Design a protein around this ligand. Structure first.
Ligand code: HEM
Ligand code: HEM
Ligand code: HEM
Ligand code: HEM
Lengths: 146, 140, 140, 146
């Protein structure tokens, strides 16, 4: 985004320690649990009746990994999240009808998952840099809405 | 609208915070100031530097009120009336900021209570902080 | 909360809306769609063209519900329960959208009631729409 | 911002009809009445106890004129709001300590005031252009916060 070389390094290095598989599945599951209305787009996934049911749902887990994957690829284009997510932005608008506010909710869930995971390592300054990243991503994804 | 499970979840999690609540209070503020620099507009009279005694002290203050609220989870409106007053009539913090502090508190708890920060506990704590925010901004 | 004066202000202003409520509801929706395009994601099944019958139809429904909240200004939570359930459980509209519609309803009224849209009335209507929004999102 | 050529004309045409002195006083007054918490910044202004006290306060009227005056200048540099508003942004942050959320509140009140004044002439699409404008100004004014 408007990341300082120092802030850039901090993001980049923590990320290299992330198991996208597990983080993606937990971020997406936590979202469905903490903000239950987000479940409106995943009725076809199955039983989301309980935290246990969501956290366990493999369709949820696999969707999470796909989301974090694309997210992960975007950290490589931090100077152009806009151009990196242009097609995905059109898709979420035009095909999926996803309110971009959801992009913000996920961002924040993501940050709680990273903290959960890295405890100590996820310092105030490291969170500040991540907050700038999730905001930039949400903004890029919302960019082609009309 | 906190369910019985939620109150249980909150009482448990907070239970583990214990003697560290003040420190978490302080760390949450520190994360807020760094992550959402606009929040600093309400503390021009504070030294916002890392490990500042003002932030530390205020962190304690915030923690204690949250503790008092867990203890009166059932009678929040009443246990926090004076605080509701102070914010509505004196401090006059814009309501959007309550969501920024709440978020930073979650992050803080996550980072320090790995085992206890389950998805269901995370959901409960979120609703609690939301409830507390509502009360605190109810007399605006 | 709504004070006695707020209540008088709302019954007075809404009183003037009278038979145009439906038309004003439709207009507030159209304003919202144009200014806050993200709100369209909730109406993928609608013809959102200028003068769409769906919008007109939808406008009336929203206006009838507001008229109903004015009629039961002392029992809103109960008068709107059904609607609260619907939005919480089936539509699952993200909370932030309520503030956008409110805002567009305020614009429409302002544009149609020059004489009644005084500062005091403006303030009362804003608190009123916030209360209706709160109710509708109460069961989330 | 993202103002189509035709949105820029609509913005400009209406603004030509506005009495900045009057709209300025009305918008500022209404803000202090609708969101009383905003009064925190004006305790030196005197009596703000009731709506008449606010709306008719000579200091509120004078201040509103100042604010809308700065805003009208912004409308002639729609291409560079950030540049236009930089010193003002710095001042609001560093000296005044005004939470940028106040700028969005003011923006919304202004839109209601324009609706109030122009009636039917404030069409849905004219409102959409102004919404983009007030957002831009609020964003430009918050750009130098730190
Ligand atoms: C970090 C932000 C996000 C990114 C990078 C992202 C990315 C993706 C990707 C790469 C796909 C694959 C579909 C395809 O290519 O055809 C997808 C699909 C989808 N996303 Fe997003 N997404 C994000 C946030 C969200 C959120 C927050 C929601 C809803 C709560 C959501 C709802 C969906 C849905 C419903 C689909 C379709 C899945 C299916 O076809 O079953 N997305 N997203
Ligand atoms: C989680 C919700 C919050 C709680 C429980 C809370 C609690 C408190 C408490 C206990 C005090 C001290 C009262 C005293 O000195 O006797 C206080 C003061 C204060 N709070 Fe709130 N607060 C909350 C949210 C906020 C937010 C979001 C802001 C601004 C961004 C804020 C700004 C202030 C300020 C500026 C003071 C005065 C500090 C001083 O001058 O010492 N509060 N709050
Ligand atoms: C305070 C403001 C609101 C009021 C009074 C209101 C009221 C209503 C009513 C009366 C209905 C029709 C239910 C029926 O069929 O009996 C409805 C449906 C609906 N509302 Fe809400 N609503 C409000 C806010 C919103 C917002 C902000 C959105 C999204 C931006 C929204 C999205 C919907 C949708 C998608 C439907 C279903 C439409 C259909 O398919 O016919 N509502 N609302
Ligand atoms: C459209 C957004 C705004 C613009 C263009 C604007 C412009 C200005 C200008 C030109 C001044 C005088 C600068 C000086 O004294 O050197 C000023 C002062 C000030 N503004 Fe802003 N303003 C805006 C919004 C606001 C809002 C929403 C608030 C608070 C709710 C605010 C609070 C103040 C205060 C407290 C002062 C100083 C008053 C005094 O002289 O004691 N401004 N603003």
């Amino acid at each position: 985004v408007h990341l300082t070389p120092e802030e850039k390094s901090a993001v980049t290095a923590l990320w290299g320690k992330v198991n996208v598989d597990e983080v993606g599945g937990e971020a997406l599951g936590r979202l469905l649990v903490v903000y239950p209305w987000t479940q409106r787009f995943f009725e076809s996934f199955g039983d989301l009746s309980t935290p246990d049911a969501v956290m366990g749902n493999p369709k949820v887990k696999a969707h999470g990994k796909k989301v974090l994957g694309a997210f992960s690829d975007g950290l490589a284009h931090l100077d152009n999240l806009k151009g990196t997510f242009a097609t995905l932005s059109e898709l979420h608008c035009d095909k999926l009808h996803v309110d971009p506010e959801n992009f913000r909710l996920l961002g924040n869930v993501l940050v709680c998952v990273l903290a959960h995971h890295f405890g100590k390592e996820f310092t105030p300054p490291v969170q500040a840099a991540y907050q700038k990243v999730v905001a930039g991503v949400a903004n890029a994804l919302a960019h082609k809405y009309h | 609208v906190l369910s019985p499970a939620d109150k249980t979840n909150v009482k448990a999690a907070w239970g583990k915070v214990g003697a560290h609540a003040g420190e978490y209070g302080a760390e949450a503020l520190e994360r807020m100031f760094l992550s959402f620099p606009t929040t600093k507009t309400y503390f021009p009279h504070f030294d916002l530097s890392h490990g500042s005694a003002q932030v530390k002290g205020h962190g304690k203050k915030v923690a204690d009120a949250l503790t008092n609220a867990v203890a009166h989870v059932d009678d929040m409106p009443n246990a926090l009336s004076a605080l509701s007053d102070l914010h509505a009539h004196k401090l006059r913090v814009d309501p959007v900021n309550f969501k920024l502090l709440s978020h930073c508190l979650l992050v803080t708890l996550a980072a320090h209570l790995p085992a206890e920060f389950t998805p269901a506990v995370h959901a409960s704590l979120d609703k609690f902080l939301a409830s507390v925010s509502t009360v605190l901004t109810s007399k605006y």
